[PDB]
Structure 1
Amino acid sequence: DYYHATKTTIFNALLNTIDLSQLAQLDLKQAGEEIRDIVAELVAIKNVSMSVAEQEHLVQDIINDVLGYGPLEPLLARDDIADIMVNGAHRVFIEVGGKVQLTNVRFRDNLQLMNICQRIVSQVGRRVDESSPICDARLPDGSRVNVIAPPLALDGPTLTIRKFKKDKLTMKNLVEFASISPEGARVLGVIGACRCNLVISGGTGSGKTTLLNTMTAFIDPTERVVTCEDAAELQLQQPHVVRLETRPPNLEGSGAVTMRDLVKNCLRMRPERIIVGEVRGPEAFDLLQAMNTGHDGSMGTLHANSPREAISRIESMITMGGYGLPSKTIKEMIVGSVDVIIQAARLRDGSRRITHITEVVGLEGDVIVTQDLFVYEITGEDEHGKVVGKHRSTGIARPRFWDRARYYGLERELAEALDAAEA
């Protein structure tokens, strides 16, 4: 009841005594203590229906106005809310238990919201205003903030926040959700630990990224990484990561940095796992060379259905590269670099499965000989509209990289998994 008018009076009185114009003076603690005392004194000096509880509340609200986020502080705190969505200064929604709901926490007006947004984003050296009404940011708490201003958004400043995620889609989620076998899971774990290159290919909707992220989660932390993504989608877990991104054409048809330049520049910064987001232009070439010159453990993605189609696509990309190499040298390079070409595909039942786990055995004539470590053999389709199969093995005694797995000190696990898969 008496919160609004009393808070307005406190704001006016404190501004008269010690306003924000004293910035750089009455440091955060100093201003907090002084404002608390001034509000306590004004509650009696001026008629204030705010009792002791309302007195502490007014002190807290003054702290918020001068310093804090105000109405978002509660929701930003609560642990049952993962995502917060503010549509104009009036309506705020929250994702509780995997579903959106409305809770009335209004802002004083649009100016307040458009100031809170800047105070939020600038915490990591950004700023959003009427000369750049878009903003996105990532924070130390694993969160991600996205802000749009009133020049575009009609309703009013629109904010979206996704707070900490901790249970990233680790392998066990893939396993138990009927998309990969256990022994295959251990084989993948070893393929990732042994810094053996890999390339991921999946039909439309196969979800290349999710898989690539699950794989990156394997790298040993001591290995410096450089992820040259197209849009900031990968969410790595290591301490040593280094992000990047491209830039599209400007209004004058210039000022663009295509991913080729980024992949070229990543060579300098002494990396040890040049991860990529997607391979469409000639960048393939550069990436492959990076795989060969002593960066054992890179990754990547591309669009193709069956692994052999993936190899053909890579060769087509390089040919589009405009370098004119013979059709044999390119194949030799691919056979020398790539070590596993995982697969991912979406089946008619709407699920998502890892159909193949293919290697690159070698070069023979004009055919790059490959062998498979696992495959997805369907058995039938159920009444509920599903497609069900099984992950079949091939009892292979030794892959091409067995020596490497012997080196990095995880030799047994590979054979244990491959042999026990027959169980």
Structure 2
Amino acid sequence: DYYHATKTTIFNALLNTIDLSQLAQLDLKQAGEEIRDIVAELVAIKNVSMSVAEQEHLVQDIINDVLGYGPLEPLLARDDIADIMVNGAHRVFIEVGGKVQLTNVRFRDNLQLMNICQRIVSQVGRRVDESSPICDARLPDGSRVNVIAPPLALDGPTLTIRKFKKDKLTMKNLVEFASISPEGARVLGVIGACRCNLVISGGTGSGKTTLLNTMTAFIDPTERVVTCEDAAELQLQQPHVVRLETRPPNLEGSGAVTMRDLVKNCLRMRPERIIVGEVRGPEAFDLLQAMNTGHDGSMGTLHANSPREAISRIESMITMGGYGLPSKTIKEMIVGSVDVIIQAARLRDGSRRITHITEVVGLEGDVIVTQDLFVYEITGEDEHGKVVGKHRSTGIARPRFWDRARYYGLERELAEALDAAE
């Protein structure tokens, strides 16, 4: 059909007629109306017109290209779409029905794709270009975006969009999915109930956010909780929860409110527990204060592949925080602050499981000595490729946080769970 060729010719004529700079002062609807006027002018110049509905569709396509997210607009609007992948202007894939598929959709040129990516990542004030060719960002519409610039992506800019889904699991789901043994369920319930400084470290795809939500589920209703998170991922059912969200900087590089500022404030809001959506910067240091300067029971999500790795991440983050903290001082602070680390990882089969429940015991020389309470042991692969394994307790009768369990009257529960966990 000539619809594609005619649309391309009309787009070229519009480009030769006006420039995007003339529409940067208009809103989405005002820009669309101005583009419709420009399209009428271009049709008059070229004396080419067609069906009114088809002309309106072409005008909408032109608006999307000029101001929207390009040919991605018809795709993002869909719901059966799981993920969108772009490997250059000439190829795009979509995850439908849980499987990848190549679509006929296409871009015009790599520069157009780069501009679209710049728009998408600037929606949250971030910029991807030759200076910072690698970018990861969050679409507050409920998705995650990755972009690589041409200097790294040899075949032009590469883009990936991953959409949301309301997982919102509960501990029953984890128990039934074998992510944690029922004895582990009791142990974790005790740990959460009795205000134990807790860090939920996990690898990519481990769903550590869901684990954090189900952990917070145990918090006593009477405790005033203030949650800091870069998005609204968490959803607590307590009656006295304060929900805060960081504000990404505008394009002018102003108005930013980073995790560090939110945690610093929360220190001054009289919270019974400070809960961080994800530790990703210097805020860790401030968070650690919240774990020891009273406020016992604070939690925090972290990206790491193992408890020792997570401790290393925390130490490195505090170090890069700009403070001249002596190395041993950071280790002492971590040892005195954290009371438990929970490791969540995705095994080769793709299932999420709580590999480690560990408690920081102390500091020896310059190494943080920790003892594992629960560990997941793998034993083989089944017929359908599923990983086979079981949770076993190290048998430690009295973990370091035992005192807190005594204070909250949970000695019996903790002892039972630890003993029967074998």
Quick check: 2:125–2:251 contact (8 Å CA) kept in 1? no
Please, which moves more after superposition, 252-261 or 120-129?
120-129
Q: CA deviation at 1:90?
A: 31
Q: CA deviation at 1:95?
A: 18
Q: State TM-score, norm by structure 1.
A: 0.62
Quick check: 1:227–1:241 contact (8 Å CA) kept in 2? yes
Please, which moves more after superposition, 154-163 or 357-366?
154-163
Residues in 2 aligned to 1:69 and 1:117: alpha-carbon distance in whole angstroms:
8
Residues in 2 aligned to 1:241 and 1:358: alpha-carbon distance in whole angstroms:
27
Q: 5+ unaligned residues in a row in structure 1: which ranges?
A: none
Quick check: 2:200–2:344 contact (8 Å CA) kept in 1? yes
1:153-196 alpha-carbon deviations (Å, 9 max, x no partner): 99999999999999952111101111110101100000000011
Please, which moves more after superposition, 347-356 or 160-169?
160-169
Relative distance call for 1:412 and 1:47 in structure 2 (3 A) is farther
1:188-221 alpha-carbon deviations (Å, 9 max, x no partner): 0000000111001111111110100011111000
Relative distance call for 1:7 and 1:302 in structure 2 (3 A) is closer
Q: CA deviation at 1:312?
A: 0.9
Question: Per residue, is there more strand in 1 or in 2?
Answer: 2
Q: CA deviation at 1:300?
A: 0.6
What SS does the aligned partner of 1:48 have? coil
Residues in 1 aligned to 2:284 and 2:388: alpha-carbon distance in whole angstroms:
35
1:209-240 alpha-carbon deviations (Å, 9 max, x no partner): 01000111110000001001011110111111
1:121-171 alpha-carbon deviations (Å, 9 max, x no partner): 999999999999999999999999999999999999999999999995211
Please, which moves more after superposition, 5-14 or 366-375?
5-14
Q: CA deviation at 1:247?
A: 1.2
Quick check: 1:226–1:243 contact (8 Å CA) kept in 2? yes
1:27-55 alpha-carbon deviations (Å, 9 max, x no partner): 99999999999999999999999999999
Q: 5+ unaligned residues in a row in structure 2: which ranges?
A: none
Quick check: 2:65–2:71 contact (8 Å CA) kept in 1? no
Relative distance call for 1:116 and 1:355 in structure 2 (3 A) is closer
What SS does the aligned partner of 2:267 have? coil
Q: CA deviation at 1:322?
A: 1.1
Relative distance call for 1:153 and 1:41 in structure 2 (3 A) is closer
What SS does the aligned partner of 1:317 have? helix
Quick check: 2:272–2:295 contact (8 Å CA) kept in 1? yes
What SS does the aligned partner of 1:278 have? strand
Quick check: 1:14–1:35 contact (8 Å CA) kept in 2? no
Residues in 2 aligned to 1:32 and 1:212: alpha-carbon distance in whole angstroms:
43
Count of paired positions: 422
Q: CA deviation at 1:253?
A: 2.0
What SS does the aligned partner of 1:100 have? strand
Q: CA deviation at 1:87?
A: 27
Quick check: 2:125–2:248 contact (8 Å CA) kept in 1? no
Relative distance call for 1:5 and 1:81 in structure 2 (3 A) is same
Relative distance call for 1:371 and 1:162 in structure 2 (3 A) is closer
What SS does the aligned partner of 2:220 have? coil
Relative distance call for 1:222 and 1:155 in structure 2 (3 A) is farther
Relative distance call for 1:242 and 1:76 in structure 2 (3 A) is farther
Q: State TM-score, norm by structure 2.
A: 0.62
What SS does the aligned partner of 2:146 have? strand
Relative distance call for 1:245 and 1:133 in structure 2 (3 A) is farther
Q: CA deviation at 1:364?
A: 1.2
Q: CA deviation at 1:404?
A: 1.0
1:359-407 alpha-carbon deviations (Å, 9 max, x no partner): 1011111111100011111110122111111111111110001111011
Relative distance call for 1:42 and 1:339 in structure 2 (3 A) is closer
Quick check: 2:167–2:210 contact (8 Å CA) kept in 1? no
1:89-130 alpha-carbon deviations (Å, 9 max, x no partner): 999999999999999999999999999999999999999999
Relative distance call for 1:106 and 1:408 in structure 2 (3 A) is farther
Q: CA deviation at 1:81?
A: 19
1:273-293 alpha-carbon deviations (Å, 9 max, x no partner): 110011111000000011111
Relative distance call for 1:40 and 1:240 in structure 2 (3 A) is farther
Please, which moves more after superposition, 375-384 or 86-95?
86-95
1:318-342 alpha-carbon deviations (Å, 9 max, x no partner): 1101111111111111000100010
Matching of residue 4 in structure 1 with residue 13 in structure 2:
no
Residues in 1 aligned to 2:128 and 2:366: alpha-carbon distance in whole angstroms:
56
Relative distance call for 1:46 and 1:165 in structure 2 (3 A) is same
Quick check: 1:39–1:55 contact (8 Å CA) kept in 2? no
Quick check: 1:217–1:237 contact (8 Å CA) kept in 2? yes
Residues in 1 aligned to 2:324 and 2:19: alpha-carbon distance in whole angstroms:
70
Please, which moves more after superposition, 185-194 or 111-120?
111-120
Quick check: 2:124–2:249 contact (8 Å CA) kept in 1? no
Please, which moves more after superposition, 339-348 or 115-124?
115-124
Quick check: 1:202–1:305 contact (8 Å CA) kept in 2? yes
Quick check: 2:125–2:250 contact (8 Å CA) kept in 1? no
Quick check: 1:40–1:55 contact (8 Å CA) kept in 2? no
Structure exhibiting the larger radius of gyration computed from Cα positions: 1
What SS does the aligned partner of 1:360 have? strand
Quick check: 1:145–1:161 contact (8 Å CA) kept in 2? yes
Residues in 1 aligned to 2:100 and 2:218: alpha-carbon distance in whole angstroms:
33
The aligned counterpart of 2:292 is 292
Matching of residue 109 in structure 1 with residue 109 in structure 2:
yes
The aligned counterpart of 1:214 is 214
Q: CA deviation at 1:299?
A: 0.4
Give the % identical residues: 100
